[PDB]
């Protein structure tokens, strides 16, 4: 908004903006060290080693 005055309101002021993950449910620690893995799950009647 613009206010009845001249003071401008933008969500830099009203909110804290950071570039973070969309969910904060899961975290991964490989040997204690912070990590992120790709746990690939098999299909159905696929090819396994292939």
């Amino acid at each position: 908004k613009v206010n009845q005055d001249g003071s401008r309101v933008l969500l830099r002021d009203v909110a804290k903006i950071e570039l973070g993950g969309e969910n904060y449910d899961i975290i991964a620690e490989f040997n204690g060290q912070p990590a992120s893995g790709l746990g690939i799950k098999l299909a159905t009647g696929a090819n396994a080693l292939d």
Partner: protein, 50 residues
Amino acid sequence: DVITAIKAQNAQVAAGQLGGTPPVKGQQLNASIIAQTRLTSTEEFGKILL
């Protein structure tokens, strides 16, 4: 007015949870918040305010 008042009271909404996903390190408890619920009977539909 009847229609609009129905979906305004017979609503099953989605409110979050106490101590959500990104927490304040030191939080002890977590509980899902229930706001409105879907009306179950003919009598509860009778008490819907217009």
